[model samples]
Target chain A: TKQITLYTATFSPYAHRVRIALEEAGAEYTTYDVDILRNMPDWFPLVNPLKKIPAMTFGGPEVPPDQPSPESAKIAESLAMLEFIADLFPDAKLLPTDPVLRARARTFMALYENYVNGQFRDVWFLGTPADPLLQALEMLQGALPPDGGFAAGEWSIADAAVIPFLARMFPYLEAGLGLYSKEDGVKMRKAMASERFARIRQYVRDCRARPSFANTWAGDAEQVEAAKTVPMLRVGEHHHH
Target chain B: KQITLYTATFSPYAHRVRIALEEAGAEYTTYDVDILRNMPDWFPLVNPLKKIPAMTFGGPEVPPDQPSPESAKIAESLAMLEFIADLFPDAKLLPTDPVLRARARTFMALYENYVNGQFRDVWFLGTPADPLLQALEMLQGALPPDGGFAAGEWSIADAAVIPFLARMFPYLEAGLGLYSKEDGVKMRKAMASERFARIRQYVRDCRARPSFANTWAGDAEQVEAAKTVPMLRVGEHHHH
Candidate 1:
């Protein structure tokens, strides 16, 4: 077994993606929480020069996370980390063994990262019309299977990739967080409750039911509290994009 | 493996899958689909999204136009790249080392997340030229400065990016974008200048590879084919 360390933060769904993957893989990895938004430590760059959360160090000499070892491989980006975890533990079936199912898993992840993630970010931080965000959510909702299952039907890394953001949406809305106007917020909540969004809601419940999600996720209230600390989520803020 | 790739000449996304297949050295049939002007009735059966760069793997030998239901129809360019890698492990489309593979994947994400949008915005939406230049510089910085591909050796990341990055130089030279003439000149000079030397070299190395050579219609032909796409109307330039 090799060493693994994840530089993570509680409020980050990006970071949560990796934690979910590591847990699903049953990885024995260490997590060092960095207060990236409020007060990021000076040494955090050793692990990630971009200073983004969910950075990792793999197969290196064991050392304290703050003092990242040069011998280890420094890996950044949550999706890349998800793939690496999947590569390391084939027995876990982090991704399906079948080529077609694996493609489904990868395609599902790409659809979210390319389409839905940006809409969520812009709606929360920039307050750019909620209509577009709602439309994007609907499009993503259409990607899921009609009956019931994860992104690729076997609880692959695709589920680990998407659930973090979907999981946060409910609590974030319930707490009245985000830069969007009250009108847009009400529209979002109502749309989310409607039958059109039924599949995604079920998908969220299925993902959360897993131990990987339960162990890695901060509870709804705690996560909402953590998100409130983010300077961008300040209500009525006029942040230009 | 009964493999078929539904592709388009104008599409960099499809070009990505083409390069991957070429590099994999697999025997695969490619059917040209004019997705812009017309899409076949059966295209939806292969890919509901109805985009180019769709693939059918391991099924009965059916005509490219009439894809069989038994075949595993795979959509999305990036997904097809990985599917090829998985299908042909000997070709080593991705590095076997997990760390090296991360390098490849991270490079891809950096391009997808940071640079690709700027290209789309500038070319189609006539967004500012400054942001596109800045994004190119950021991508340039990601490349191995001394030499070599994104992950030390050729990987699918290079295949993913070179299609667009190669098109950019020719497209700018031909002045085929929606951006202002002044911005077009800005992009042309910026791409040729020493500031972008590394990325230019990166494109050159990728193009030199047989995979790129076989997949790409030469720069002139590519720009000519790109002319057919209605979005790229060079008739009147944006004033902004």
Candidate 2:
């Protein structure tokens, strides 16, 4: 096995999702700063024509004498790669074994992609200004399983994938995002901070406890403060549920 | 401690995870979530949106199960699996060493991009003949070198992919105008290896597991119907 190279941006939730997955799975690989904000690396577009950060490259299985060629595995898309890698290391068992559970897990991820994490980002950051924050919340509210736990309960990549947005939304909801306190975003944050997603919060805390999570995502208060200006949601853009 | 697998049998993705549990030889209890219908009560605490594959250890270390709605829920499959594998080291499903793990992870990412993502194109929607070949071509290019199983050993990448491949094969075959092409033929052959054989056994083994025999496979007929109706995902089911 050759050294695995992972290319990613620092603050992207998509990138973080991959990082956390790798770390938690206990997979070792070299991290290359994509500096997506700067000139996107020439290597990135070469490896991933899709031109996204969190691109990965791997060495092919050692060739026999007859087959002297070695190929490279290049892939883009954070979630897909995460699972693919999980499969490469059964010891990691990053994925659930039960088919139904796996489907349920996939469903939650789908919902997050389609609804909760889906609308909130558009409502708050993604330039989709047409929809108000509350409308996003309404979408989230409707997606909730009435009594199920965080996105599919259990500590999952979904929780890790979503925490950043949750953190951002907490503050946005506090300011009311042009719609005043229909639901106190701060209170919601507090609710989140307090008890909202105990499983995922604990997962976050667990991630924080892990040196990998800390080393990668442990933003200083300065970084946190800096992040305040970063944009996650755009105005007027809405996702179809 | 006994393993508690939060799942539904009908889901092929869940089947991948279930096969892993069988491979790991772990004992677990199944919790089904009727995603097509209503999500159960307890699942939300495990997963914010009530999706499945949410395993819980009754141990003190696991954070409280339920949380306020304000918090973000873990939603991605890879992250969930990584957390679970780490949360229970004894399971040893993930590679222990870091770099080896990274390689494994990279393999998984490739699986998602090449196999999982492109898979939807084969069966979910109606496709013209030309683009369907492109999808197959793309899939072939991304396959793993040696075992051709997407990964050398039956790692999580194989677990995550094979089941979906199994479910999607009939459709992909028809679309490509070939029932068994290089990619599918190679994968099936690779999966039959003595070392990689567990995955093949797992495919059948998974059927007997409570999650499959009782839950997911019960809906096997429904899924069969679904494939014909064109339940496609984007980027996965490309127009080409």
Retained native contacts per candidate, as fractions? 0.73, 0.08
Instruction: Supply the global lDDT for candidate 1.
Output: 0.88
- On residues A1-241, what C-alpha lDDT tens digit does candidate 2 reach at each position? 4646677666566777777777766777767666665466554566676567777776665433122223665656676666656656667656566543454456456555545654554444433443344444444444434554444444455555655555445444444452223333444555555544554454435445655457666464533543443444323333332
The residue pairs that clash in candidate 1, if any, are none
Q: What does the lDDT come to for candidate 2?
A: 0.51
In model 2, what lDDT does residue B23 have?
55
Q: In terms of docking quality, how is candidate 2 classified?
A: incorrect
Give the number of colliding residue pairs in candidate 2. 101
Please give the RMSD to the true structure for each candidate, in Å.
2.3, 10.9
What is the lDDT for B39 in model 2? Answer: 60
Mind giving the per-residue lDDT tens digits that candidate 1 earns over B82-201? Answer: 998998999999999888898999999889988999998898878899998998898888788999999999999999999999999889888898888899888888888999999988
Stretches of candidate 1 off by over 4 Å are A237-241
B40 Cα displacement, candidate 2 (Å):
6.5
**RMSD (Cα, Å) of model 1:** 2.3
